[PDB]
């Protein structure tokens, strides 16, 4: 389970 990048959840 890789950590998502800082902005992975930004449009």
């Amino acid at each position, epitope marked *: 389970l890789l950590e998502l990048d*800082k902005w992975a959840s930004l449009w």
Partner: antibody
Amino acid sequence: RITLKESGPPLVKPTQTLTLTCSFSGFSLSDFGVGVGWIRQPPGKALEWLAIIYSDDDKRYSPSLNTRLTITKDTSKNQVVLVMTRVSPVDTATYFCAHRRGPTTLFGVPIARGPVNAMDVWGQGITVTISS
Amino acid sequence: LQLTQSPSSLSASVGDRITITCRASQGVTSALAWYRQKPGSPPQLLIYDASSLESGVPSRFSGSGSGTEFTLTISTLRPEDFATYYCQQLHFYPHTFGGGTRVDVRR
């Protein structure tokens, strides 16, 4: 406009600690979302990502190297520092620092992700050799 | 996750159109960049966000893909293009690079 320069020792002995510095111009680390990262290339080999620090002091490290890596920054001095403990000859490489853009913001709010997805500008590199 | 770059090496001559590709172990949306590295030099950004041309980069470069398959494309090879090329993913930590693709003069 953006320039990055690495500084540090050319030769370090094994078991020692290596401290490297990026000094930059053309951006500020108080810019929103801006990151500075470190990458290394072993001689004759591909690039390996080591660490990143953001303007909010958020930092992330390579899992294989996490234990030995510390990243810190000084916003006023325009400098970022990487510390590696317990060096060994594996760690002989050219070490680069690079700048990562923050998101597009309109009037201080982030509106687009896209610019973030690269390291735009790199330093020239500094070569470090670990030998006893 | 791992980034696999094909081919590892390819031969070309000036004015050639070449295509390098990158496959990811998992979906990384569009968070994929491409770099060119000339021997003795630091990598230089070509394409960010999978398809966006870096300001100041010759139009001959172009990129495509989303999800797991990505392709960099040079339409007209120039001399300064004989170099090594890298992709990077920035969707997950840690930000993986590919293994590289050497591009030499054909003979």
